[PDB]
Amino acid sequence: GRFDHFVEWYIYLHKRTVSDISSSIKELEQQVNDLQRTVDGGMVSVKSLLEQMKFKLSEAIERNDAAVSSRVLTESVQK
Amino acid sequence: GRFDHFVEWYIYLHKRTVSDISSSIKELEQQVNDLQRTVDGGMVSVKSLLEQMKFKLSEAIERNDAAVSSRVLTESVQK
């Protein structure tokens, strides 16, 4: 049996009983907004970090929309 | 013959010739100044690149001092 897949799934249920969308939304947006308010003059030499952060925020803003829209059982009752 | 080592060494020499020795050492201090720009932006959150560049300065101090000093001759002459 895929017990490693089970323990990763169980970890994701524990951190999806509020504390993963929190991570994907709040801290990623606040890092992105901090960089956006940092770079108001431009200057690619720290804008390099920002595009990586915004791409990571986009990558984590995927893998969540299907998890909310295609959800019949809530993520705690499965646990 | 370690042509891999030669071509890596020769890209090192090209970068150091066109940038590090034509108008002094610049590619490390520009990202040092990037860290001095981003060190007081609020929440720090940049510990991944806070220390991985700090020992690059130490690398350029304790390895290039032999190559620029009296023991090993001038790098443009090596090229």
Short mmCIF file of N, CA and C in Angstrom, two decimals, chain B residues 22-67:
data_model
loop_
_atom_site.label_atom_id
_atom_site.label_comp_id
_atom_site.label_asym_id
_atom_site.label_seq_id
_atom_site.Cartn_x
_atom_site.Cartn_y
_atom_site.Cartn_z
N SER B 22 38.29 45.07 -15.34
CA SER B 22 38.29 46.23 -16.24
C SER B 22 37.85 47.49 -15.51
N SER B 23 36.82 47.39 -14.67
CA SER B 23 36.30 48.52 -13.90
C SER B 23 36.06 48.08 -12.46
N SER B 24 37.07 47.41 -11.87
CA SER B 24 37.10 46.87 -10.51
C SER B 24 36.01 45.83 -10.25
N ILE B 25 35.93 45.34 -9.02
CA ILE B 25 34.99 44.27 -8.69
C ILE B 25 33.61 44.88 -8.49
N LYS B 26 32.64 44.43 -9.29
CA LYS B 26 31.33 45.08 -9.33
C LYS B 26 30.16 44.13 -9.17
N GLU B 27 30.25 42.90 -9.70
CA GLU B 27 29.10 42.00 -9.72
C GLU B 27 28.75 41.46 -8.34
N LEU B 28 29.69 41.51 -7.39
CA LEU B 28 29.38 41.15 -6.01
C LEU B 28 28.85 42.34 -5.22
N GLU B 29 29.44 43.53 -5.41
CA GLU B 29 29.00 44.70 -4.67
C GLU B 29 27.65 45.23 -5.14
N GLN B 30 27.24 44.95 -6.38
CA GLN B 30 25.91 45.38 -6.81
C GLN B 30 24.82 44.60 -6.08
N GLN B 31 25.03 43.31 -5.83
CA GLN B 31 24.06 42.55 -5.05
C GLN B 31 24.27 42.70 -3.55
N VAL B 32 25.46 43.13 -3.12
CA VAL B 32 25.64 43.62 -1.75
C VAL B 32 24.77 44.86 -1.52
N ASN B 33 24.79 45.79 -2.48
CA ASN B 33 23.93 46.97 -2.40
C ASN B 33 22.46 46.62 -2.54
N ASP B 34 22.15 45.54 -3.27
CA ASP B 34 20.78 45.02 -3.29
C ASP B 34 20.34 44.53 -1.92
N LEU B 35 21.24 43.84 -1.19
CA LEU B 35 20.91 43.43 0.17
C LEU B 35 20.78 44.63 1.11
N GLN B 36 21.61 45.66 0.92
CA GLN B 36 21.47 46.87 1.72
C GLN B 36 20.19 47.64 1.37
N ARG B 37 19.69 47.48 0.15
CA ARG B 37 18.39 48.05 -0.20
C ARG B 37 17.26 47.26 0.46
N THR B 38 17.35 45.93 0.46
CA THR B 38 16.27 45.08 0.94
C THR B 38 16.41 44.68 2.40
N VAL B 39 17.37 45.24 3.14
CA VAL B 39 17.57 44.81 4.52
C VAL B 39 16.59 45.51 5.47
N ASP B 40 16.07 46.67 5.09
CA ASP B 40 15.21 47.46 5.97
C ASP B 40 13.89 47.79 5.28
N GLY B 41 13.34 46.83 4.54
CA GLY B 41 12.06 46.97 3.88
C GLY B 41 10.86 46.56 4.70
N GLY B 42 11.05 46.23 5.98
CA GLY B 42 9.97 45.76 6.81
C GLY B 42 10.26 44.39 7.40
N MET B 43 9.38 43.43 7.15
CA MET B 43 9.68 42.04 7.46
C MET B 43 10.79 41.54 6.54
N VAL B 44 11.76 40.83 7.11
CA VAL B 44 12.98 40.52 6.37
C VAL B 44 12.75 39.41 5.33
N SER B 45 12.37 38.20 5.77
CA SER B 45 11.89 37.08 4.94
C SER B 45 12.84 36.68 3.80
N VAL B 46 14.12 37.03 3.87
CA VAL B 46 15.04 36.77 2.77
C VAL B 46 16.26 36.01 3.27
N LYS B 47 16.06 35.15 4.28
CA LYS B 47 17.15 34.41 4.90
C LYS B 47 17.80 33.40 3.95
N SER B 48 17.10 33.00 2.88
CA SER B 48 17.68 32.07 1.91
C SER B 48 18.84 32.70 1.15
N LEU B 49 18.70 33.96 0.73
CA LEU B 49 19.77 34.67 0.05
C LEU B 49 20.47 35.68 0.95
N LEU B 50 20.17 35.67 2.25
CA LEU B 50 20.90 36.52 3.19
C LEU B 50 22.31 36.00 3.44
N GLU B 51 22.49 34.68 3.42
CA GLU B 51 23.76 34.06 3.78
C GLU B 51 24.47 33.36 2.64
N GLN B 52 23.76 33.02 1.55
CA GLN B 52 24.42 32.33 0.45
C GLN B 52 25.28 33.26 -0.40
N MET B 53 25.09 34.57 -0.28
CA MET B 53 25.95 35.53 -0.95
C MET B 53 27.03 36.05 -0.01
N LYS B 54 26.79 35.98 1.30
CA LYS B 54 27.73 36.53 2.28
C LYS B 54 29.05 35.76 2.30
N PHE B 55 29.03 34.46 2.01
CA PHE B 55 30.27 33.71 1.90
C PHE B 55 30.85 33.73 0.49
N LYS B 56 30.13 34.28 -0.49
CA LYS B 56 30.74 34.51 -1.80
C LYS B 56 31.79 35.61 -1.72
N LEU B 57 31.54 36.63 -0.88
CA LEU B 57 32.55 37.64 -0.60
C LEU B 57 33.76 37.02 0.09
N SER B 58 33.53 36.09 1.02
CA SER B 58 34.63 35.39 1.67
C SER B 58 35.40 34.52 0.68
N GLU B 59 34.69 33.91 -0.28
CA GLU B 59 35.32 33.12 -1.33
C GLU B 59 36.22 33.99 -2.20
N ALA B 60 35.71 35.15 -2.63
CA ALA B 60 36.50 36.08 -3.42
C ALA B 60 37.61 36.75 -2.61
N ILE B 61 37.52 36.73 -1.29
CA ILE B 61 38.61 37.25 -0.48
C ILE B 61 39.72 36.22 -0.33
N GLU B 62 39.39 34.99 0.09
CA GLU B 62 40.46 34.05 0.42
C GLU B 62 40.92 33.20 -0.77
N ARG B 63 40.28 33.31 -1.93
CA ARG B 63 40.78 32.60 -3.11
C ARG B 63 41.39 33.51 -4.16
N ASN B 64 40.83 34.70 -4.38
CA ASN B 64 41.38 35.59 -5.39
C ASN B 64 42.59 36.38 -4.89
N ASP B 65 42.84 36.40 -3.58
CA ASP B 65 44.02 37.09 -3.05
C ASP B 65 45.31 36.43 -3.50
N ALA B 66 45.31 35.10 -3.64
CA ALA B 66 46.46 34.40 -4.20
C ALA B 66 46.67 34.76 -5.66
N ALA B 67 45.58 34.81 -6.44
CA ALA B 67 45.69 35.03 -7.88
C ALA B 67 46.02 36.48 -8.23
#
